[PDB]
Amino acid sequence: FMVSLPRMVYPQPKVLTPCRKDVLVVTPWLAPIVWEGTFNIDILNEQFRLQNTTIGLTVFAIKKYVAFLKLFLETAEKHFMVGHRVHYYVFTDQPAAVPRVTLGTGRQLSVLEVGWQDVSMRRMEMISDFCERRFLSEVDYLVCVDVDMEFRDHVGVEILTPLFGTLHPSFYGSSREAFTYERRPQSQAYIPKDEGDFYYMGAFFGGSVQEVQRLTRACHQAMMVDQANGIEAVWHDESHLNKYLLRHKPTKVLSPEYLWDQQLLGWPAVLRKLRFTAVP
């Protein structure tokens, strides 16, 4: 059950005036593609706060990657879901190397200790196999991101939806034949040259807990089949994520504002904001 929104004063949306004319803002299966200018964050914040939404953010920081946690977490505090309940889940082989980062009210962090083929499967296995009941009890949505990143601008409830992927920044303007999908028919991640909507990045996906566990379970199973068959997909769990999102369409797609590499790709005019970016 959803209570009424309060009275709000904001500019009238204009039917005969698009917010963005330069980019595709809805997929052919009627999922919004999230770009700056397409959303009124005040309306969305109201909708999600009225449901007392809790967002879980999962991040793996193994071996040398623990060094990235301080900037990752400090910038998440500035930019990620501010105002909403947030639970960080840091999966690491070095619990003691996790920095003590000061968190805003309503936000918490849990450190989860973890122990080549298993390493590739680790993340999908952890989210679907071991953390299943925990997540269902603790959060409404799960977001899975890479640690060697920093938030530079708002990343908020505009992304939340049953299932989302993010446009890989190297491929958003590419033809599908150029996408680095797995191309060997012997792999469960196989996608033919005449299929594919988008190339999604493994570094940022999520959705409701139920849908994220479905995705990670399916990818983990597919990866185990490939292992048994002596094959490893070209881009590992990203190849499987792409296969899954081809066959189970996401209910939102995030624009490359949400996954960018400024050193490699600059700041094109089509990106009004750079929200979550690679660390040089």
Any idea which residue has 């998440």 for tokens?
Answer: 76
The answer to whether 91 is a known ligand-binding residue is no
Burial of 38 (0-12, 13-18, 19+ CB in 10 A): middle
The answer to whether 62 is a known ligand-binding residue is yes
Of the CA atoms within 13 Å of residue 28, those in its CB half-sphere come to 4
What structural domains does the chain harbor?
Answer: 1-280 (3.90.550.10)
Q: Which residue of the set 77, 158, 182, 238 is catalytic?
A: 238
The answer to whether 158 is a known ligand-binding residue is no
State the Cα–Cα distance between residues 173 and 195, nearest whole angstrom: 16
Report CA torsion sign: 122, 128, 134, 139. Answer: positive
8 Å CB contact between 92 and 98:
yes
Report CA torsion sign: 65, 68, 73, 78. Answer: negative
* Angle, alpha carbons 252-253-257 (nearest 5°): 130
Residue in 53, 233, 77 with CA at minimum distance from that of residue 155: 77
The answer to whether 146 is a known ligand-binding residue is yes
Residue 178, φ and ψ in degrees, nearest 5: -85, -20
Residue in 151, 153, 156 with CA at minimum distance from that of residue 272: 153
Tokens encoding 239:
């190849």
State the Cα–Cα distance between residues 2 and 10, nearest whole angstrom: 21
8 Å CB contact between 190 and 182:
yes
Tokens encoding 277:
């970016």
Strand order in the sheet with 163-166: 33-34, 252-254, 163-166, 204-208, 141-146, 54-61, 85-92, 107-113
CB atoms within 10 A of CB 227: 14
Resolution (A): 1.4
The answer to whether 118 is a known ligand-binding residue is no
The answer to whether 15 is a known ligand-binding residue is no
The answer to whether 148 is a known ligand-binding residue is yes
How do beta strands 33-34 and 252-254 pair? Answer: parallel
The answer to whether 97 is a known ligand-binding residue is no
The yes-or-no answer on residue 113 being catalytic is no
- Amino acid (1-letter code) at residue 35: W
State the Cα–Cα distance between residues 25 and 54, nearest whole angstrom: 26
Tokens encoding 70:
């301080």
Which value, in Å, is the radius of gyration of the alpha carbons in the chain?
Answer: 19
State the Cα–Cα distance between residues 45 and 244, nearest whole angstrom: 29
Any idea which residue has 């999604």 for tokens?
Answer: 200
The answer to whether 159 is a known ligand-binding residue is no
Task: List C-alpha distances in Å: 13 to 19, 37, 210.
Answer: 9, 11, 33
Q: Give the DSSP letter string of the chain.
A: --PPPPP---PPP-TTS-S-SSS--B-TTS-BEE-TTS--HHHHHHHHHHTT-EEEEEEEE-GGGGGGHHHHHHHHHHHBSTTSEEEEEEEES-GGGS------TTEEEEEEE---HHHHHHHHHIIIIISHHHHHHH-SEEEEEESSEEE-S-B-GGG-SSEEEEB-TTTTTS-GGGS-----TTSTT---TT--S--B-TTEEEEEHHHHHHHHHHHHHHHHHHHHTT---TTTHHHHHHHHHHHS--SEEE-GGGSB-HHHH---TT-S---EEE--
